[PDB]
Amino acid sequence: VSLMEKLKWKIKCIENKFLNYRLTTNETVVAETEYGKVKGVKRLTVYDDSYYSFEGIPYAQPPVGELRFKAPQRPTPWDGVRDCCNHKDKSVQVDFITGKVCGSEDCLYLSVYTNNLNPETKRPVLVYIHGGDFIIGENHRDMYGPDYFIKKDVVLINIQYRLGALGFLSLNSEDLNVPGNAGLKDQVMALRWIKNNCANFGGNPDNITVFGESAGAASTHYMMLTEQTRGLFHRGILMSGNAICPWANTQCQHRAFTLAKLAGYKGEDNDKDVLEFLMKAKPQDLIKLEEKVLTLEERTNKVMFPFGPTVEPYQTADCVLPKHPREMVKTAWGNSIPTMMGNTSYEGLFFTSILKQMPMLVKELETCVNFVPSELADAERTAPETLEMGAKIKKAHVTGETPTADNFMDLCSHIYFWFPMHRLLQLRFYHTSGTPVYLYRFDFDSEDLINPYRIMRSGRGVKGVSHADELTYFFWNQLAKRMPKESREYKTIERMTGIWIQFATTGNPYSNEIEGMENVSWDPIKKSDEVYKCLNISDELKMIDVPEMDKIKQWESMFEKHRDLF
């Protein structure tokens, strides 16, 4: 990120702090939880809607001291009233704009928002799990403001969970009780809190919807796969990701030693001594060094992050992922709840700045062998069959004589989002009994209203609907502004939140009360479908054949002679 954008961001942070003061009312309120009373505050939005805000509700003990790298433990109850009128820290992470480490280990909190704490009817509860590659993100309202959802009669809950090595260290030695996935176990404990407490805020514990984008979509899917959460919620929405995406998990058990050595460890590679060192390290040091952990071999093999969700090496009481997610699909409780999945119309545009920094990446399109799924490729990627598979990828995405950056970004949309979604849909059809899955495609482009991800991708003046551009129409953020009622952006806010709320309520995303959706016939995907239909959200709402289908079929064709691996 440029120095000029860093300055603009600092200015926006200050202006946002004072806007939030002006949006705070003097009305506070007390609600009950199973652990004690909490005090929240009534806030306004720039549209003059209002909501009750409870931030910093603990769902677990702070994971500090001996609890570092462990599964979350239930919090200590309190007498009196806990102040929830301000946000807590985010999980330790490298700030996506400033490049400096920020946050705290004391980050296991959730926030609850509703326009009415004593409504006449129990409300759909929507639970948002943020993305950020399992290494960044937060539930702060400067990124995830509830201001648009609270226009309607729902309860919205935004959770945090541990990130990076603090959330995802994994050690093989059973005696140490660090099997992995602490950050997913945080999510489980938060969902249990929600089930047990949402009624105190006007919510219906029989009607909970979990949704998330990017790593939050992978997370939502994990929460639909694991036995730990069986029956805890009732609909799921996977926005640009799922648990079988290549980036969504990794076997990181050998990387703790590498991290320890980077942090000054002088001992041998055994889990006990490595853990002892990591338990004493400062958390900022571990998170800062994470970017150096992947080895030359792992970078060669396109491993994207050193620590993340993992297949746990031994079973524990709190185990989330006992097998690879593809195997978990076979028995997953969440296959039988209404599900909605979708992507944006130019996901891979997210890689714009990476391609500007490393333009030679376009040369990988000459043969495309490095994009062939690893389960199909020979180790050296020189076998004729592997070259043939790469040539199929190349034909799908290289549209002119010479490969371009846009061809590369189109390929990225497929390898990271569309193809895993196709594979998931097809696998899931073997392991469900008619429970509906609906597809959307977010295809609304504007730079009149933006979110901070555009800065991170250096996307000023860039046309196209990148990964994460839809979040602007779900959440207020500190770069947002009030839009006119008649504006295309305002209508998109109403449509996107409206569809999500309709789906959360009924398990069916269609409602004739959403403007522009009256003529929509939105059917769920059938196993017999050869071409997927989706609701495309542009300036209009239209059911269309997924435009990506032909390319999806070209990727699928690599498995014609390896169908057991598809």
What gap in Å lies between CA 242 and CA 409, rounded to an integer?
A: 19
What is the b/e burial string over 54-75, where b = at least 16 CB atoms within 10 angstroms of the residue's CB?
A: bbbbbbbbbbeeebbbbbbeeb
| Options 221, 234, 414, 467, the catalytic residue | 467
Q: Which helix (H) or strand (E) holds 94?
A: strand 93-94
The rounded Cα 468 to chain-centroid distance in angstroms is: 10
Active site residue 254: no
Which string of DSSP letters, residue by residue, matches 301-326?
Answer: TT---SSS----SS--TT-S-SS-HH
Rounded (to 5) percent helix, strand, coil in the chain: 40, 15, 45
- Kindly list the distances between the CA atom of residue 212 and the CA atoms of 70, 89, 203, 222, 245, in Å, as whole numbers in the listed order: 24, 20, 19, 11, 14
Asked if residue 477 lies in contact with residue 452, where contact means CB atoms within 8 angstroms, the answer is yes
Strands 155-159 and 541-545, sheet pairing: unpaired
Residue 156 DSSP code: E
Q: Kindly report the backbone phi and psi dihedral angles of residue 276, in degrees, each rounded to the nearest multiple of 5, phi listed first.
A: -55, -40
| Type of residue at 188 | V
How far does CA 363 lie from the centroid of its chain? 30
As a whole number of angstroms, the distance between CA 410 and CA 482 comes to 33
Q: Using CA atoms, how far apart are residues 54 and 201, in angstroms rounded to an integer?
A: 10
**Beta-bridge mates of residue 203:** 123
Domain closes at, from 337, 372, 403: 337
Burial of 153 (0-12, 13-18, 19+ CB in 10 A): middle
Closest among 366, 350, 352 to 417, alpha carbons compared: 350
- Is 511 marked active-site? no
Q: Domain check: are 146 and 271 in the same one?
A: yes
- Do residues 410 and 396 lie in contact, with contact meaning Cβ atoms separated by under 8 Å? no
The phi and psi torsions of 153 (rounded to 5 degrees) equal: -90, 70
Beta carbons of 468 and 348 less than 8 angstroms apart: no
Domain co-membership, 284 together with 373:
no
What residues contact residue 441 under an 8 Å CB cut-off, 6+ apart? 342, 343, 344, 345, 534, 535, 536, 537, 544, 546, 547
Indicate whether 371 and 280 sit together in one domain.
no
C-alpha to C-alpha distance for 15 and 21, rounded to whole angstroms: 10
Which of 309, 337, 365 is where one domain is finished?
A: 337
Cα–Cα distance, 535 to 341 (Å, whole number): 11
What distances in angstroms separate CA 316 from CA 60, 65, 161, 176, 179, one per listed residue?
Answer: 18, 21, 19, 11, 8
Distance CA 535, CA 361 (A): 33
The DSSP call for residue 124 is E
Same domain, yes or no: 109 and 4: yes
Of 221, 260, 227, residue with least CA distance to 241: 221
Strand pairing category for 339-344 and 235-239: parallel
Catalytic residue among 111, 170, 214, 466: 214
Same domain, 421 and 385: yes
Q: Do 353 and 246 sit in the same domain of this protein?
A: no
> How is residue 196 written in tokens?
């047990």
Question: Domain span at residue 484?
Answer: 343-566
The verdict on 324 and 358 lying in the same domain is no
Q: Are residues 41 and 188 in the same domain?
A: yes
Resolution of the experimental model in angstroms, please?
Answer: 1.1
* Residue matched to tokens 């064709």: 557
Q: How many angstroms separate the CA atoms of 4 and 8, rounded?
A: 6
321 Cβ contact list (under 8 Å, min separation 6): 180, 181, 184, 222, 225, 226, 249, 309, 310, 311, 312, 328
Strand partners, 209: 126, 235
320 and 412 housed in the same domain: no
Rounded Cα gap, residues 398 and 51, in angstroms: 50
Work out how many domains the chain is built from and give that number.
2
Structural contact between residues 322 and 315, judged by C-beta atoms closer than 8 angstroms: yes
Which amino acid, one-letter code, is at 394? Answer: K
- Concerning whether 214 is annotated as a catalytic residue, the answer is yes
Map tokens 């219906």 to a residue.
Answer: 204
CATH at residue 157: 3.40.50.1820
d(CA 545, CA 533): 4
Based on the fold, state whether residues 281 and 356 are members of the same structural domain: no
Strands 235-239 and 541-545: unpaired
- Nearest 5 degrees, angle CA 145-CA 151-CA 154? 85
Nearest C-alpha neighbor of 86 from the set 53, 131, 37: 53
Residues in the chain, total: 566
Amino acid of residue 316: T
Q: Which of 457, 250, 242, 267 is nearest to 334 (CA)?
A: 242
Nearest CA to 493 out of 510, 509, 480, 512 is that of 480
Report d(CA 171, CA 270) in Å as an integer: 10
Burial bucket for residue 459 (CB in 10 Å: 0-12, 13-18, 19+): buried
Last residue of a domain, one of 337, 370, 385: 337
Residues 173-184 as b/e (b if ≥16 CB within 10 A, e otherwise) read beeeebbbbbbb
Question: Are 380 and 408 within one domain?
Answer: yes
- The whole-angstrom separation of Cα 482 and Cα 490 is 9
Catalytic residue among 138, 290, 347, 489: 347
Neighbour-count burial of 566, counting CB atoms closer than 10 A to its CB (0-12 exposed, 13-18 middle, 19+ buried): middle
Closest-CA residue to 465 (of 443, 494, 498): 443
Burial class (CB in 10 A: 0-12, 13-18, 19+), 402: exposed
Same domain, residue pair 330 and 368:
no
* Residue 341 in tokens: 């999945």
Amino acid at 277: F
